[PDB]
Design a protein around this ligand. Structure first.
Ligand SMILES: *C/C=C1/C(=C/c2[nH]c(/C=C3[NH+]=C(/C=C4\NC(=O)C(C=C)=C4C)C(C)=C\3CCC(=O)O)c(CCC(=O)O)c2C)NC(=O)[C@H]1C
Ligand SMILES: *C/C=C1/C(=C/c2[nH]c(/C=C3[NH+]=C(/C=C4\NC(=O)C(C=C)=C4C)C(C)=C\3CCC(=O)O)c(CCC(=O)O)c2C)NC(=O)[C@H]1C
Lengths: 313, 315
């Protein structure tokens, strides 16, 4: 099963109970964005991140009464149609708001049962993706495909290190390709125990395909209330990219000297084949539109891995 | 019966009838569609060899001036990028794309690929979260039918085409329209089947490697390359990888007879075989700009993946 989260007086995580940390329900988010939850029917704002006032520019109480209808007039009917009752928690809808306080915000919404989860992040506003797609497809074998993928991602993102991390049948991981800035350790060829990515994190990574830590020293921002009014239970945040990263894993990143971390799941035959794993030495908020490019690349790599593995077997 | 290609018309080959469909050498028509321009150049020196006859009007230069310069001089910023992206021996399927600001012609999209020692350069005029939203909707579709319906509707919304169909090949290469989105008033093609010769065997092979082709105007005359043969080889210039390549006259007559002014199709490739086609029709001529066509190319790949996934959920 899972332990209760901390804020419901559950045990603190150690290397003895790695498998039982409820990483999906931390009750908090990373501070480079803001999150609201809301009722599926009424559009009634039920929870907000204590930092919402910053991003939205709204007097705190104003929000926690109001309706999405009021708050987001153009958007609220689109949401209603895009995310019908009963849809999967994996389905997401995005829009760009030109919002008074903040030039442009990206809005990302998904639905978990009766709750809409809304994420707001700063945003903005060429051929590198098309060029990359063809490059991946003409790679002659899996090894070269891995090399092209890591190089392409590094060029698109500027990340200090990009790896392709492949899982063995026992969930033992191996760095099979790597693109990195001059003057970093090389993790190419190294293998790592399955417990570094514990079972409950691999399962969530099979369904929700991109996650990140933007700053491995930033404090999480609580949800208020912490419990969902609807249920008097924790809000599931595993489909939210703003979801606070497990401190156990933030500690693992700080000990490596990493300030910023992102990965994309590569999913083949319904199973987690590997990760595009990215490191930055300093804090780094990759903007939403560039993340989208990596999300596309994730799908394309999933296709090409199967194609390429089929021409060996 | 499968038989080798006839020589093209310009090398004294025969004219194509219902009898000899499968032997038309559609990859080497010696000509392009008039809404863009094409140059060929030597892959090592960058000497310009062939150009479409309309090139002066896209590029704003006399032929003899174009042909008298190397790509190093014509494309000083792109020439080194081309050479890195398209190394000798690379496959003909690999494409490099850039946007140019050309004085006379505005923003041009440049698409380049390499066939042996030849570079092929295509120039076309070029111009929010719809793709991301579509990607997730496709993935959440519960079964093959719902996927097919979401895919057709999405493509129609992105493009404004009068008809978008998902055409699926059977094992005998006959095809069936298994989903479609269509303009009000058009008659349904859903559930209809069409014989294997409708898309002959040398088109199907080409459609497994080069995943998008189009006819922007089913009545437009093709524009010859000049000279027609590659001076490197005194042989035909391979245009199978060029979206500008002229469509087979057989296929154009087939489309005009259906009342179609514009056609586009994307290949859906599963396990190395052509599974089906995203096939679009417009009643009037219609040019879809290169950046919009890129969205369809990306959806072609997504759909190939999702078709595998939906079919595996099915035994
Ligand atoms: C007591 C449990 C431990 C633990 C927990 C844990 N680990 C993750 C997720 C990841 N761990 C990763 C490990 C590596 N990163 C590398 O670069 C290498 C090798 C060079 C390894 C072995 C990775 C890549 C992830 C994925 C996330 C990312 O992209 O950074 C989680 C889940 C965190 C979350 O999503 O909130 C958890 C709870 N890790 C341990 O090492 C043990 C001590
Ligand atoms: C004697 C040969 C004939 C022939 C040739 C031919 N066909 C193609 C390619 C295509 N044919 C298509 C036919 C259809 N369009 C539809 O809407 C339906 C069903 C409702 C069918 C059966 C299609 C879709 C294609 C693909 C390209 C496209 O138009 O989007 C070629 C190759 C064309 C080229 O790349 O230059 C050729 C030579 N078709 C016949 O019917 C016989 C008489």
């Amino acid at each position: 099963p899972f332990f209760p989260p901390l804020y419901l007086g559950g045990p603190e995580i150690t290397t003895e109970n790695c498998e039982r940390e409820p990483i999906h329900i931390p009750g908090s988010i990373q501070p480079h964005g803001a999150l609201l939850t809301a009722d599926g029917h009424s559009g009634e704002v039920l929870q907000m991140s204590l930092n919402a006032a910053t991003f939205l520019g709204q007097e705190p109480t104003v929000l926690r009464g109001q309706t999405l209808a009021a708050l987001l007039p153009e958007q609220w009917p689109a949401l209603q149609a895009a995310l019908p009752p009963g849809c999967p928690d994996a389905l997401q809808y995005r829009a760009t708001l030109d919002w008074p306080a903040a030039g442009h915000l990206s809005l990302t919404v998904h639905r978990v049962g009766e709750l809409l989860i809304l994420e707001f992040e700063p945003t903005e506003a060429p051929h590198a993706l098309r060029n990359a797609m063809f490059a991946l497809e003409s790679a002659p074998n899996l090894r070269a495909l891995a090399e092209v993928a890591t190089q392409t991602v590094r060029e698109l993102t500027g990340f200090d290190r990009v790896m392709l991390y492949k899982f063995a049948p026992d969930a033992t991981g191996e760095v099979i390709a790597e693109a990195r800035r001059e003057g970093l350790h090389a993790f190419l060829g190294h293998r790592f125990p399955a417990s570094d990515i514990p079972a409950q994190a691999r399962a969530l990574y099979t369904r929700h395909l991109l996650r990140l830590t933007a700053d491995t020293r930033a404090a999480a921002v609580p949800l208020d209330p912490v419990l969902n009014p609807q249920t008097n239970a924790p809000t599931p945040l595993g489909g939210a990219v703003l979801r606070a990263t497990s401190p156990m894993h933030m500690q693992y990143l700080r000990n490596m000297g990493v300030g910023s971390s992102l990965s994309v799941s590569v999913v083949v035959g319904g199973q987690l084949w590997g990760l595009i794993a990215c490191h930055h030495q300093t804090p780094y908020v990759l903007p939403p539109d560039l993340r989208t490019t990596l999300e596309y690349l994730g799908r394309l790599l999933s296709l090409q891995v199967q194609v390429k593995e089929a021409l060996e077997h």
